[PDB]
Amino acid sequence: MREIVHLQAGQCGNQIGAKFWEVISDEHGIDPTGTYHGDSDLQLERINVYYNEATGGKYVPRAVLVDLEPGTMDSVRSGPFGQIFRPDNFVFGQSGAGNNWAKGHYTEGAELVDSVLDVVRKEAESCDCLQGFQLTHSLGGGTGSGMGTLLISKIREEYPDRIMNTFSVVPSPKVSDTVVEPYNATLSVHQLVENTDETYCIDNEALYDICFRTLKLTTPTYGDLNHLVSATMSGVTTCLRFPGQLNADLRKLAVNMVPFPRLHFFMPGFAPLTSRGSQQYRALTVPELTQQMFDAKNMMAACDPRHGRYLTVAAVFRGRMSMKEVDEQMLNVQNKNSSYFVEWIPNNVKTAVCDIPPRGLKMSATFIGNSTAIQELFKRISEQFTAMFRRKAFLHWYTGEGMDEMEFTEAESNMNDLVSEYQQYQD
Amino acid sequence: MREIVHLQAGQCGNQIGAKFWEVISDEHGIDPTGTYHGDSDLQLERINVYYNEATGGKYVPRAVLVDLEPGTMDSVRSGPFGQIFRPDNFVFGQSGAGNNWAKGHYTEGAELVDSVLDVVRKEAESCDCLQGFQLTHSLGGGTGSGMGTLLISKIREEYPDRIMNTFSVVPSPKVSDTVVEPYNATLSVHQLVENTDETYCIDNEALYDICFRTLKLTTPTYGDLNHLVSATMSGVTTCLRFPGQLNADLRKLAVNMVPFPRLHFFMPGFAPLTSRGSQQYRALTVPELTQQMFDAKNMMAACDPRHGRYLTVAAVFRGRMSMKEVDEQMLNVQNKNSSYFVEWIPNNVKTAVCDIPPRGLKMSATFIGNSTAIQELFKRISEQFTAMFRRKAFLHWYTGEGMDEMEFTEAESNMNDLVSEYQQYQDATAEEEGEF
Amino acid sequence: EFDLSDPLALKKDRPARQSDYDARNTISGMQKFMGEDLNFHLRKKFQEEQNREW
């Protein structure tokens, strides 16, 4: 019906994709070998949105797993849910990306992109009507940030009128693990500003903040961060997989989100998140969901929304609830504080309501917020970039791959004018 | 329908709040885990004034717990009602205030207050129609006085038409605890005058004298004085939670006892207090209650009312009683003592009756007294402050934190302005026009 | 739709998570996380005993 071809590039991309596909298999009732064993007929209705059908009643994901070195996809193949992907879609290289954007964009990813485009064409034209693709990667790496942007570009000149989603993970200055990632993040956000339709900026610092102050986890690993990302990844496309009193697919959260084509950098957020010991003091109602959902700490991007004006806000509720509860909470939020919302748009909140909740849950909701406070996620990275670039810090690893130094200049200039774009509606 | 967001700052505030919430929960029928277990139906109708609804019949209080030392949170969690508080509302610091008003007001209580204001705004905007706030703290402490004054100053500028009651604890003439109590005491009164609606001064020596004379307690502890404090907090708000022949909420007491905006320092007193050996020697009648209530040896502030004049007096009664007897007793106590009531106010008594007594109690009453004998409480603090500040007794623990020397001057200037204002209203000709 | 307007609906409603394990704590609910280390103190004590004998 309305199919989504899921792509992932990189280590971080593949570990998020494993969590996401197991989460969707949880939602649609798919066992670790591929078949169906659920208890409701609603789970087979739009199961072909994410899955295909083989002989013998086997459901396979519409997934394309791309990497430049075989160990990571060997790791996801041997995981708890590695037996559900068709082994054709596993594409690897031999020499790694080396945490180098130029390698993944010119040297090693360009000689791999033809087979991956072949697989993308084979899997993306079995469907009747293709809603759009979906990419998971990070901007701080080399193969997700480098070859992933190449992948977005080549599936943009071939499928112009589709939906592009990128659940990118931009780096954080406070939690930084590679000394080169300002270059990669700048050169990838140079491409993501015009090759994507929506972009969901997620920070590892914000995920660690959530796991430390909200969930009170003793030892949060990367698996819990991928779980929190896949929560919102499943929450944004729940109305075209399940019925609802007010349906809203992926395109409706784009026309009602971006006022101008250059402003599509959002920040997700999942509302019903509770600590282990604070479970019995919680009432699962709509006001408690919407006051937790709008909180500054609950954002999955490390920018404080109280420093800027909200442009437009989504809320895709799941569960069984009345409608004026939601319609009055979203009106109360806009009425209480009129200085954090822009004045040239009368209604800044879009409501989406589904019916089927997450499994074992009474009610859930997700957040998609477009704000002018996202510019400080770009000012810090641009300042680090111009700290490194003024002395040509690590440029011999990039210029030797064959890219001119003009590319960095145009990348930082477009990051600067994106910042100045997000600044003119701050006042 | 008329909710009260509770606040408690410092060790004194938290130890008072634990006993206060125990008494409220015993009144409304809440077990030490949270589930309602009452017998009648009036205990569930107005439960939302102090409580919130959670799943399964469990009720979570409206309180916010603020401190700078985690040991006090450890002690307030180890009590018989430590499980009923929501774990998110516990806000603590890492380093204690050091018994310093300046530290807890400027350096350590500055960054910590943002999370406390976050809890307050989270928990106050979920109210059907909020009435106001309460605060229990001690002005002689470090985090209590400084962070409570900061909390009140920040709260009043965001909700400028609510009710801000403070059950503050004033320092001591006779037996004190700390050396630097006069500095914090004279720096806290400045904020309470401009930023509070009602201020209740509770003195520890008056409670000690009550426990030693009226109750004959062998070992009065802090959990023993906090019972009397909790009784006078619970008796004030009894008209909101239970029906009455004559109802008076916090705003009615606000209107009746405050003739001018700067004079809102009151004098609590609880009526049915009687020792264990003399329990069977009393006949519980309304004249007994009003005879003990107006007694000079029953106030919770160490300042007798014979040394001043009664500007206005409240008497909130609980239990089934007759209105004619109450009104004639107030009449008799006004007419017998003529020189102790001001003459430019004809009737100084506000009466209120609620027909539900406290649990176990049969009749009870609460004395709220606006007297001009409260000025002598400020006189002693002013004398001790002038004894200290004349030679920089301990200023290097305040000025090094960023405070100014001139900041200590405006404190006692405004405090003595309040003293002079009370003095001028004490001796005023009732039959006199004025310049205007 | 009496359930959406039941005044005592919150009284008969059960918490999202009751114990450390029951049926409706599955990974699509975001209520149970693997990073919460139940049996963490026991692992530290066992490893300390191994170090002691060594």
Place this chain on the structure above:
Amino acid sequence: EKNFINTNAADVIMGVAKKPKPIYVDKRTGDKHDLETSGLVPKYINKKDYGV
């Protein structure tokens, strides 16, 4: 050097009152709503660009 009776009266003699915010009660329970934002009073008819 200030008489606190003359100035306490002068602060209410040389003053102005606080004008209330118009609020209508809709139901018998006591639910209150703002009057200006809800479409009951005529507000946007008096705009400068009406009909032009």
Place this chain on the structure above:
Amino acid sequence: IRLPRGRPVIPVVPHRGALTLAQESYNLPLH
């Protein structure tokens, strides 16, 4: 963190303590 004590009873007053001048004197007339 376990519960320390059983909380001695302190029951309500037998005859008063639950009637609020409208439960009494405003019942069924029924003389």
Place this chain on the structure above:
Amino acid sequence: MRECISIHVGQAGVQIGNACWELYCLEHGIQPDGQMPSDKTIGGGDDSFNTFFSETGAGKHVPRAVFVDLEPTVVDEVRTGTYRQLFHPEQLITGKEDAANNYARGHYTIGKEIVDLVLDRIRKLADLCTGLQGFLIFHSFGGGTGSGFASLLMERLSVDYGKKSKLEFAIYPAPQVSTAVVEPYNSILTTHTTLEHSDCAFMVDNEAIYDICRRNLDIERPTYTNLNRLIGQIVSSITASLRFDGALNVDLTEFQTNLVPYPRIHFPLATYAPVISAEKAYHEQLSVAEITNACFEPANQMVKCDPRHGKYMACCMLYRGDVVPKDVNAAIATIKTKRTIQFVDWCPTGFKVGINYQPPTVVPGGDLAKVQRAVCMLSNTTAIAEAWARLDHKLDLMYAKRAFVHWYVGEGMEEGEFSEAREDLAALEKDYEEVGVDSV
């Protein structure tokens, strides 16, 4: 065909209307559930409930009353009480936060919110009124809701209905006891705004009813229900002509013409004559002469004003029960010969009479005795100028220092309204003096 709308506003109004409507239900056959116990006639049955109760299609009678309060804890007792099924749910209006002893809350900010809801409910109740006579408003002069919102109700009703009759049942401030401090401010303001929007204003004190309950009735330590039952008996004897047979019927329009001589003096005092306990009634014959003389006793008055300190201007007398008009004639002829009872020269008549054959009803639980005769006397006397002078002095003492005016000036009411309200009642003070002097 004789319907009157009772508008109870405030805690005093609601608690008075509780006893009033209990006695209205008990006087007719209406159960607390709003249904008759049976239909003894095949198709007949008296329609005498039409003054107070509106019958639906099947069998249920609904009161023609509006209960207004700004605090939920007084109306919620009626809402969950015995007469819960009797009242229509939308007839009990309730605010969220109360006026709290302040006239400004009830007149400018808080009471101006629910005024539309009460006006539409009043219009809906007046729509079923076939022969509507006038409104009866119960409030108190000392509260915030009962002083401000009742005045706002008169304010709106004069605009929306014109010259329709509206009688008051006020609770006047007592001269020595009170339950508030800012009571004189509310009294002066709500007298000033309703000096002219009220056709009549029957007032009773609370200390005077305490004295009557102590002295005439045998009971000590009384509660508010004992006062409310007496006020309900007064309001039943006022409206007894509309529902029961009468030798001389007294319409509600007759009170303003036979009791208000001049366009501002409309404050008569009420008194109920044979208010005695059962064992005092056992030893006493209660003939028309005795209970006519007992109305003019200074101790038996329900307002704390000595009638010997002033001059009677007009008297309206309502009789109930086994009453011969011959004895009424003789008893009123005897009173005019007395010297301790003095009248004004320009009113040689001074009396309006009304006799109703219905004896007063005995509510169970009340302390009043079953009597065959009763008089509810409404007397307008010049002796009330003592009470206005004492209220004048009590306002004066506080207004000299401008105490408590920050609570009023900070809520949309200017200071000047005190200066003109006090000036207007200071005019009314000598307005009473001009009608007390004899022309020679």
Place this chain on the structure above:
Amino acid sequence: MRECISIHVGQAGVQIGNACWELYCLEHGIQPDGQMPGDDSFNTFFSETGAGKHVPRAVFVDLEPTVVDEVRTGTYRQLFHPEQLITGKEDAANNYARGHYTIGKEIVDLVLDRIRKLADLCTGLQGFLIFHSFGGGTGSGFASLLMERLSVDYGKKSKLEFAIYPAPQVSTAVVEPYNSILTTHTTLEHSDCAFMVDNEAIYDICRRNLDIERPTYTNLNRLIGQIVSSITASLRFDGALNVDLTEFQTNLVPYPRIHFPLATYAPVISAEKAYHEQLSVAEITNACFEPANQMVKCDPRHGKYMACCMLYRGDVVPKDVNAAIATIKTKRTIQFVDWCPTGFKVGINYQPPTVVPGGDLAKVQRAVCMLSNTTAIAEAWARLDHKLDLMYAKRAFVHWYVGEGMEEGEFSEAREDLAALEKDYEEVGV
């Protein structure tokens, strides 16, 4: 003889029809499977076939499948013919341009074919009943194209509009002023009478009249279905005064640009409150003119009435109607314009309104559906115009509309038309 072809567009249209056809099938003796366990009163909505199946005269249209598939898998699946329920492939996604220029052309032909095949069975075709919403993409875009195409092949045939206005305070979308301005600019010459309801007003009505706090969209759909059943009740049941569907346009629309009357269903009370209330004709007709009972959140006291068409149900005696409207004509609250000295159109039916199991409203013997054309709607047009002028000043969200083959001048020539509409609403009150 008296057929009526219903058309439901969008999610709002399908969910409204799911209650309307529930009420229709329960009104007659029609089971969910289409059989009847004989009178022929159902021909206004049902056409009988050779197999004994009563097929509704409705065309359920949407551009998104998963709101029509619940008709296909629900409890009323056997009742509906397969070609009636028509779905697209991609939704317009809150875009007028997508539903009017790109996606609507693929489905307009098939919907026109089903409309024509449904109109061959109608010997006495009266009019089309259209249900849609102004805020949506399909319901604002494809429905307007449906009017533009239906006005050519038929012409003078009656068309009735049952549209959902944008709410005053709440709004579930962002670009819904753009959708509203365009479907109001282009429907003006292609709609005979546009009945207006508002979601927030019905929200308040079920909050304060019924005791159901927190209703969902289903209760609103049931109230709208009750209004629609009262509107066409004279075609199926005996009445003292019968009202045809072409009388509404003649007695409610003074000028062709002004065809936006209001809705009001009078005795909408709960079963707890019906015990203490007699529900006579005067009481319900007085509750009609109370602004707390209007289904559009506006105050009619701040304007002048233009006309009034008002209907009756159940045991209604005409002299009570006479005196009850004579009372309303004497109230200073209610005012009419200079050029309408007559004011009222009256209809009386005999069928009491039908109850639904598990419903909200109580079983009553009398009911009134009042249709008022008032000048007080001019506060809504000015406010929607201001909400547009906030956004169109900085050219917000225009790029999502020029992509689907609409030039930039369409917004401007819409704003010109409804500036003229506001001028017409002001200039007739003089």
